[PDB]
Symmetry: none
Amino acid sequence: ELPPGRLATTEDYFAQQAKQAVTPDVMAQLAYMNYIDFISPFYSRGCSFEAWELKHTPQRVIKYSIAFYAYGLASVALIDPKLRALAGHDLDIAVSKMKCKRVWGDWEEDGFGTDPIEKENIMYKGHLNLMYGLYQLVTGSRRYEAEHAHLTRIIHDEIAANPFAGIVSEPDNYFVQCNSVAYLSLWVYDRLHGTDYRAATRAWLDFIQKDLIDPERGAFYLSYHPESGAVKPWISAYTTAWTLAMVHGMDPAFSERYYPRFKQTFVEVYDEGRKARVRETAGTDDADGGVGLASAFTLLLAREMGDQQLFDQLLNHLEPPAKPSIVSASLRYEHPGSLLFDELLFLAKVHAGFGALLRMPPP
Amino acid sequence: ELPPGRLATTEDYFAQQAKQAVTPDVMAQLAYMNYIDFISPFYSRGCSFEAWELKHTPQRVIKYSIAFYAYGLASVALIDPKLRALAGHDLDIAVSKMKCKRVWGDWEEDGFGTDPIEKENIMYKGHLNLMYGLYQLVTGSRRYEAEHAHLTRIIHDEIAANPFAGIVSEPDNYFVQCNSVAYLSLWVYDRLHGTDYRAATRAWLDFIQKDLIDPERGAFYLSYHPESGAVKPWISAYTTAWTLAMVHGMDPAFSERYYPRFKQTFVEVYDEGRKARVRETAGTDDADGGVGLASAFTLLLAREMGDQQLFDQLLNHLEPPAKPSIVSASLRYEHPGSLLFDELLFLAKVHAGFGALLRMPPP
Amino acid sequence: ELPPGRLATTEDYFAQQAKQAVTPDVMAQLAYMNYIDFISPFYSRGCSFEAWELKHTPQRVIKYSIAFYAYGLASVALIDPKLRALAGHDLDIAVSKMKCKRVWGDWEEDGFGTDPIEKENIMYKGHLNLMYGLYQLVTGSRRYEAEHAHLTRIIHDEIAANPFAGIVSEPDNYFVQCNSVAYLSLWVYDRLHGTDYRAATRAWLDFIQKDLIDPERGAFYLSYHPESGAVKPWISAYTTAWTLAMVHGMDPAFSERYYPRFKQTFVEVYDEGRKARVRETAGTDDADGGVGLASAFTLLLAREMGDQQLFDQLLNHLEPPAKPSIVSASLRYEHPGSLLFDELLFLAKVHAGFGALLRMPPP
Amino acid sequence: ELPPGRLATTEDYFAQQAKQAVTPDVMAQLAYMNYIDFISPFYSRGCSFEAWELKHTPQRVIKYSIAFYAYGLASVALIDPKLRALAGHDLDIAVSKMKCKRVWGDWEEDGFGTDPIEKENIMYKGHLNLMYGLYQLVTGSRRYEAEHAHLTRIIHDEIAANPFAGIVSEPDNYFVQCNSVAYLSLWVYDRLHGTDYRAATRAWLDFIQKDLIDPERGAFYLSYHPESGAVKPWISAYTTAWTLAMVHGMDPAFSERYYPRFKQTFVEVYDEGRKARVRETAGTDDADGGVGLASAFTLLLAREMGDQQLFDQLLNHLEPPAKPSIVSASLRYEHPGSLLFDELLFLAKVHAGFGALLRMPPP
Amino acid sequence: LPPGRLATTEDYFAQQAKQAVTPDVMAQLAYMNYIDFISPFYSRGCSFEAWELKHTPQRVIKYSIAFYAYGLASVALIDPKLRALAGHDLDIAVSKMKCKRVWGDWEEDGFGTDPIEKENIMYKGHLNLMYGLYQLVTGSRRYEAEHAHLTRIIHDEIAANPFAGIVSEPDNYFVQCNSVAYLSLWVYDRLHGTDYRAATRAWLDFIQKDLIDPERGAFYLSYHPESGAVKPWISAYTTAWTLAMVHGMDPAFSERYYPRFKQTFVEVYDEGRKARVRETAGTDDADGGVGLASAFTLLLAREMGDQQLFDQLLNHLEPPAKPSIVSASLRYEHPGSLLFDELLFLAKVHAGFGALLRMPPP
């Protein structure tokens, strides 16, 4: 059956790639993304952010919104070849908008520098480098090749120069989740050019397993701070869910080791097995604390790991209270339950696996 | 009878040109446009937009407001010779205001360039080139002749240089409706100077019939993107209504072919044949989705095509809930149902046909 | 008797000059104008507009507020010699405040220039030139003589250089009412210096009788636009009332010709002959449309023309619903019915005739 | 007895100097003035006006607030020697704050000049010159001696240059009350240095008795305007009360002459002799019109003239409806009835007489 | 456990011995560190989102950051597993303290463009103590150059003044702000083996002559060197803060006045279960003025080892503030004063300013 308040079955979402068609509700999300002049997020390459003003997206989170849209569009390209030209066009726009000062300008306003790419700031330039790669996989266009080579060399050189494996975001803030994106961006560059930038990944997976994970609980600590050597002593569900999802595309064995322990630690099954919600940290019964993204990031992880049961449970918790409706063949939510809501449900519904995106066949 | 909340019969609007007089409610709209110091839209040539601030007109849509007023005024000049001097004065102001940075400045704010005319941006300069032509047909004034020749040569050269037939708006955004205006502006230049810029029209009508239209449904796709070759895979009522209305003035056979199919696809007759409302896309029962202009643009198409029944039905849907009143011989609407409301009802009530404007007798 | 909500009889207002005393309510208006530190309009020469902020006076209309106060004060000087020194002091302040950028700055904000006097802008500099003259008639002070000569020569030279008789306001906007003030300012300069700048008046009265008036209806068209020669094809009561009032001081025969026709066209007597209200244009029953000044400007015209009956009727319409009260010997209105309310009722109550102000005896 | 809503008896206020102690409520006012970090008026020398922002004090009136606090503090120094060091410290701050541009900057914003001291502006620099003097009488400090000599010489030279006796405020605005302060400041300089700047006072008292006072009513006209010779033809209670209070310190005979006539003209005793309120002008029954300070300035005059009965009557009108309370040994009013409320009640409660302040013994 | 309290007074006082913070202190550290962008200790940036959300007035941000820092230095001493974290938070505390949002009132008031060069001890005293506590906790020489520069400015300015200490605003002398400056010299001396603290004896002599009422054990509000004036009101928050800091330099001084301070200002109520603190004399009203007398006295009670008064004050302060833990993170629905979560944090963990001085190295 179709549980109440849902738009399509878990069977339907997982069958999209095989049926070579997106579900009607994913098509209605692409319509929200592309249809109305000026105010749709993928209307033009311009430095126009009307779509994010209307959703009340905080400035600091727009970079994550654009990136999550981009990762979803790369899966749409793989699902339906008739939509691959459209997905490529949207990715062109995603890259253009990602480079606008509205998106990266927090870096300058906080006093960290005038150039968002030259040093640090992996939370921005990791996502940008992955988007450059996914654009070229999807389209075969060399439009951003020069910028892509420049940013990839910056990421490689900065990893090589650091005593810890990886790159900080704000100075003296190290986040595994933001590093995972940077490392995946090196895999994609290597797939495009036959280079071996991804070689640095082994050292990184060794490093994050020493100080930054609780292996019994299958959960990463919130953050690391190289100057003091401090690890914030709380484990984080959203941090772990995101990291495991991306690492599965580079070292599947790593994510398969920790995933069942991650679920025991954080996932609460309820309503006689029909629903699930995710605790953000230990020592609490409360779901979706902190940034409120544990359930939505776990939905993406469930998709990456092929876990239909947990996917169905999480989507039954997340989607119905958001009261989705289709108006003029376009998807809207009356009560989005978190930041980045339509972005993450879109991405989770279409996600083909970061592994599959790496191996994407040419046009 | 006169249906309730309407100001004049469909017979009266269609009879204006023959009776050589505008209806009282059209005269009351011209009064709103011209009467009150400072706050009327056609008060002066200055870069003053108080009239648009009071209507809460979004910046990006002011260019369309001024242009629609201009197209209406050109029909007023043809209807009533006693109003032709007034119409000419308002068109002078329309051109002046259209050149103010408040109107075109989105082009610079989005990062596309400091000059709105030199390349691309046909959604602005197409309307501006048509207004230059209509000003000169109405008045016989050579005030803008030099600017008109310069912009016409830019449009001609840009068409000749493109591998696709026509000109983009934002870079890599191609809209048939905005191109239709550019092509009509070449017909008007040709009428004024005995040139053959309109020769490029055949190639354009061939091109938009290959990839950009669904001929069974008589409906254009939303947009085309030359870099990717992508066509947004949704059909658009407002896009089609506007395009067919303008093309009818250049190749009437083209619009006559698609019009009946356009009506089957999008038009919903309701209230026992008294009213009509227009769906914006396929796969929905919802009227006036998207930008919300399908009904109002179809009202203009009905006028262009001489379809009194559909004109009457659409106006019975649009005008009454907007609660029009005449106060001190000046027309206002308490609840305009869309953007550009008074502009499009004005234009639809007076529209003599784009063909007739081309053949306008001298003063 | 004294109708309800009125403060004094029409007989009393018309008798003030003969009794050599203003009525107590006019004295209470002078107190509003002069009494309270900082917030009274005539507190100081400074560029301080607290009095206009408290009345919510729109920026563009402050120049008209100051001017109307000034015209009233010139009549106060003529009515009561004991108040002539005070009236002169208020006129000093009126001239100073008129020259503040808060007052003329719209000229620069609209993009027309950085100097409000060098060319055009007669709606500002006409009023300023008349105020310079009235200040010197009232006081005998040579304080502004140099500025007065400079501005009078600018107005004279600009009239001489124009192919039409007079001067525009905004570029290509000609208003008879604003020109009437400029021409009267030349009569006043001539009275002060024995010059013949007023000679240009004959050509102006000839010109405004050809194209700008409807002689059967005794009413001026809204405006004239010299580039196109277009006349906005609506007649205006406030335009006509103001123009006839000022022209009566230069060519009384002209205003006497049109006044009875003006009243038939626009004035509605109601409440069994006790009240009157003025239509702003033709083809309406609605009173005080447009800027909403037709009744108040007609009150001043009735005073200028010596029409006690119409004066009484208009004041019975205007004053009572405004709910005037005297607090601490100072006049206030709870519900002013229009812009410039206290200014125009003040001016109409004291107005000695523009002819009489011209012939003002020395101090 | 102690009337209801009062904090201390008139007997207690008048006995403070003799008992060498301020009343508890005066001590609680000094606490409001000095206690809370940042937001108390006498917190620091800085250009910080948080205390005046919280009381919503209009910018133009801050100069008067600081000055009235200063005059009160000079009496506190005389009443209680244990508080004289504190009073001196507060006067140091009063002088510093008085010199901040927030306080004098209206002079520049109005266009009268960039220097508030060089010419005119006696409403500011009169108060500043008196404060320099009172600071030095109270403390013996030579901190401001150089500035004090410079400003005293400016005042002396400007009096000597004027054809009328005294100095204008805004150009062409002469106020007796603001002049009275300037003249008293010369008496204080003379007491400090054995000079004879006060010699100019005889000519000033002769001048203000000719044109500026109504001798029958014992009341000064609102203001004088030297360029026109105009006297605003209304008498002013607050103007007269302030002037007589200050003149009593220089020529007691002058104030004793007019005081009984001032009370007949303006003071209304009510509630069977228990209360009094003061009319601001003639030809009204309304109390505290205009700036609303007639009652509070008359309270200070009653104190200066030793009139316990009128002091008690006015304080019974002013204090109770203001709903005073002491919280944490600090005085507040829930409903202050006028501008400068706590400042003027403070000053009136402590005022030792301007004569006594002149004769202040050294520390 | 009284209702609306989160932990017993026994639990807070036992933290150092148990080498663990209580769960509610851990939940305060989580509020301080957990959520991206909006948590106060998220980054070194000149970003004040955390203080915008708490509606912290500009002039008081400097005190918020400093009180967090003093609490974190005690956390380092209580739980060695949290000492690296506390060091990281102190790094951020110092960075944020140097942002113009924090010190910029000095320039807006017209006193100067440099907040460190002269005067302004209410700012640079706290900053100099934070530089010291950062280096005690971490061993990091990151700020050593700035710390030496500011310490030498404070020493030279004390040496130049005819009164013992340094003004805040020009001609405003506050004992509480000076107490911090002097303690910052003790910490510099502990780090470098210098004798800047030598100036302390003259300072304790001076504040006992004119600035205290010894019968009432209470300091006057402020002193003004140009006039020699002492504002003639005694202040509870002024005294509580000063006695707490002086206890770390001259314990005998604070032990002399503490019992008299309590008689003068502290009101025990609700049958001995609660206490609240009068801000001045001649009033029955509690927590007048800046409203910090009760919260500063809670810190003093902790410094002086007075469990009974600590329990009484916390029973007055915490329950009406309606604390709750959501997702292992502490919030208060109705904070009863400025700097509420900052001062309850500091009072719950405070090991004594003496103990912080003697902090064992990394």
